[PDB]
């Protein structure tokens, strides 16, 4: 999406690949975790993501 | 999920009139031209295609 000339389009869309996600690694024993999870699901659950 | 959001009110009023029990009912209805569109998960619809 920023390629000069746009001569590179990858094979597939993750169908024959790992297809993982990205998250936030918190320390074991943090009370912030449920609040951060609710905030992320609010950020996805309204179209803002 | 659409009832929470800020602009999905008319589509909510349209979808609440003809809610279906199973997804196979929706498949048979859109197959028999009773429906014309259906919101559904993408890869399941690719498998059904």
């Amino acid at each position: 999406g920023r390629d000069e000339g746009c001569k590179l389009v990858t094979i597939g869309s993750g169908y024959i690949f790992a297809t993982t996600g990205y998250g936030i690694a918190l320390q074991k024993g943090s009370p912030w975790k449920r609040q951060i999870d609710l905030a992320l699901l609010q950020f996805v659950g309204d179209g803002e993501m | 999920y659409f009832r929470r959001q800020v602009e999905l009110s008319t589509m909510y009023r349209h979808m609440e009139k003809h809610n279906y029990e199973s997804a196979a009912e929706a498949i048979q209805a859109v197959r028999d031209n009773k429906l014309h569109a259906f919101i559904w998960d993408s890869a399941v619809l690719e498998f059904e295609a």
């Binding site: - | 800020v6 602009e7 009110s9 008319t10 009023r13």
Partner: protein, 454 residues
């Protein structure tokens, strides 16, 4: 049966028609031993009431009491419920403090109040707010009794809002006004409808504090129930002209019809229990020197004099008569609305404002707005009868719809509107921070001067 009648000084009701409340009443008298004892009392002290209970209980076995109050002491109703847990006699609290909403009734008492619960009155008030489409509101609750289940019902109603009610958080006051911490809680309110939950003189003090701080504008509405208001005859100081109250003490539906219907219910209960069980008189002999067939779990289904006067499971009427009043500019609590059987009807759907609140409060905030039906701009649709609510991205409007082609009468139809100009008006009300007065045109199109007539 033998039923005692005692009152105070409510509505200047004479005792003569109370003594004459036996002749034409109960024309189909199947129980023979039905008599009345109709008296009065100078005072409202509960100890003398206990004295009269112990006098009349041994007074030829009186098996009934119909008591009404003129004051605002709800503890007298608690004393009568305690006596009904001792004498086990069905006692009807009619008006005043004898029928006020206490916290939690017990199954070990047969005392009955007339009216509805505080949650049903809150449902009626939220039905009023739904009919008037005022969605951004506040809730100020003190340590006034009955607060727990009332605030819980408000929270479950806002959490179950198909309307999408914007409730500002619960302003709590542990004590009276400190003028340090309670003032900050009063100045957090920027909503439209302020809901106050306290006693009468506490409401006078809170309205005086709000008027002294300028929190009593026509943007800042005030709706209180009957238990916050108190006596309908006494109107104290610092009331905004337009004070919405919901009560049931109508001067058109007076005390005499209430006590006649109550005696009709008691004689109906006596006749219904007489056809089922024989030994109906079962009472305590005398109060000195200390549960078979009662009427508490017996009169759930009853419809007396046509109107539904049935009993709830929590000791109230199923369908009472609700009266919604406001305050005019003449310091009078004027009757506005009544309640239907199932739903709620309102006479003044068009809402007056009663501008004379203070020395000067201008109506420059509101702007008269009229438009024409335009498919990309003014999208006009019906109101949903299943919800009776325009959804929150749409705004309601009124239309003067004429009935016939050669008449001068027309009604007002409220319809929903969405579109481009709706969004423009909403964003102008966000930025310029004004209020809108939206209605529809009845003469026709945009404009054309037909011989110096537009």
């Amino acid at each position: 049966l033998n039923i005692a009648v005692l009152l105070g000084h409510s509505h200047d009701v004479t005792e003569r028609e109370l003594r004459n409340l036996w002749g034409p009443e109960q024309a189909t008298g199947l129980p023979l031993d039905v008599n009345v004892v109709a008296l009065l009392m100078n005072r409202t002290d509960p100890k003398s009431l206990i004295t009269h209970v112990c006098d009349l209980m041994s007074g030829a076995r009186i098996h009934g009491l119909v008591f009404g109050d003129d004051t605002d002491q709800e503890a007298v109703a608690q004393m009568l419920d305690f006596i009904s847990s001792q004498t086990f006699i069905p006692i009807l609290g009619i008006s005043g403090g004898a029928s006020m909403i206490m916290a939690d009734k017990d199954p070990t008492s047969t005392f009955f109040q007339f009216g509805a619960s505080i949650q049903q009155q809150a449902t009626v008030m939220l039905k009023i707010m739904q009919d008037y489409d005022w969605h951004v509101f506040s809730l100020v609750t003190t340590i006034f009794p009955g607060y727990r289940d009332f605030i819980s019902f408000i929270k479950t109603t806002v959490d179950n809002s198909f309307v999408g009610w914007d409730m500002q958080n619960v302003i709590t006051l542990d004590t009276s006004f400190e003028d340090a911490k309670t003032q900050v809680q009063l100045k957090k309110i920027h909503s439209s409808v302020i809901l106050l939950y306290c006693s009468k003189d506490e409401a006078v003090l809170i309205l005086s504090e709000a008027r002294s701080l300028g929190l009593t504008g026509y943007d800042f509405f005030w709706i209180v129930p009957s238990l916050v208001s108190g006596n309908t005859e006494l109107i104290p100081k610092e009331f905004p002209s337009g004070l919405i109250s919901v009560s049931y003490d109508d001067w058109d539906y007076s005390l005499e019809a209430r006590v006649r219907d109550g005696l009709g219910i008691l004689t109906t209960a006596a006749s219904s229990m007489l056809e089922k069980f024989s030994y109906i008189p079962e009472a305590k002999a005398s109060c000195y020197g200390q549960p078979l067939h009662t009427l508490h779990q017996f009169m759930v289904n009853v419809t007396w004099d046509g109107k539904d006067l049935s009993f709830t499971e929590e000791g109230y009427q199923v369908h009472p008569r609700l009266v919604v009043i406001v305050l005019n500019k003449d310091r009078e609590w004027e009757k506005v609305g009544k309640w239907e059987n199932q739903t709620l009807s309102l006479r003044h759907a068009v809402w007056p404002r009663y501008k004379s609140f203070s020395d000067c409060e201008p109506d420059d905030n509101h702007l008269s707005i009229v438009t024409l039906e335009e498919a990309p701009f003014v999208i006009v649709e019906d109101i949903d009868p299943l919800t009776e609510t325009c959804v929150r991205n749409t705004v309601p409007c009124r239309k003067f719809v004429k009935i016939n082609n050669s008449t001068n009468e027309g009604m007002n139809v409220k319809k929903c509107c969405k579109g481009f100009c709706i969004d423009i008006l909403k964003k102008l009300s966000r930025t310029v921070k004004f209020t809108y007065d939206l209605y529809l045109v009845t003469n026709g199109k945009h404009g054309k001067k037909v011989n110096n007539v537009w």
